Design a protein around this ligand. Sequence first.
Ligand code: PNS
Lengths: 77, 119
Amino acid sequence: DDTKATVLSILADLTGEDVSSNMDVNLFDEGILDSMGSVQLLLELQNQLGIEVPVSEFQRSEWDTPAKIVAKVENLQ
Amino acid sequence: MVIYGTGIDLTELSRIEAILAKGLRLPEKILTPAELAVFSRYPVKRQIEFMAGRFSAKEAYSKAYGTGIGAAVGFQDIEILDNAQGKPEVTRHPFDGPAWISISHTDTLVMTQVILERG
Ligand SMILES: *P(=O)(O)OCC(C)(C)[C@@H](O)C(=O)NCCC(=O)NCCS
């Protein structure tokens, strides 16, 4: 889907590296995504895809790998 | 009465400014209506620092609260408005106990600390 590619492109911009070949990296534990980035992630998803994710639906533990984030986004779409 | 949680946060103002300069709706996401009204009256340099400090304070609070920002506590569940003397108080928050907040900044950084107590 264009959605998965867009999610992975947003993540690449935020973390500074291509995570498409690294879909299970724990972004927060490795220090490539932090709090602030996770908010920017929500803003980008809404701006670029029209998918608003309310913070009540966001739990770091369930949004902490690229694969999980794509799954979360794919569904809402 | 005992400590329930603590949280501190150190935030780079230029990261906030970059998000704001990109035109993203960070203020609407992070700030309550009352906080947003205050933000709207400020010039840019002050808007960056205010925005950074609120982001910072609410991150710090969520760590004291135990969970980080998310389903247990979101940005819209915490409100922080300065007194008429300029003193910040946690006017709204989910925890049933005293909440302590302090904020300080330079031109480039903001630092916040929260302690929660349970009676
Ligand atoms: P968020 O806590 O994921 O953002 C991290 C941060 C760069 C914005 C920073 O200001 C912060 O709060 N870092 C806390 C993480 C840390 O210091 N870990 C070392 C102990 S594992």
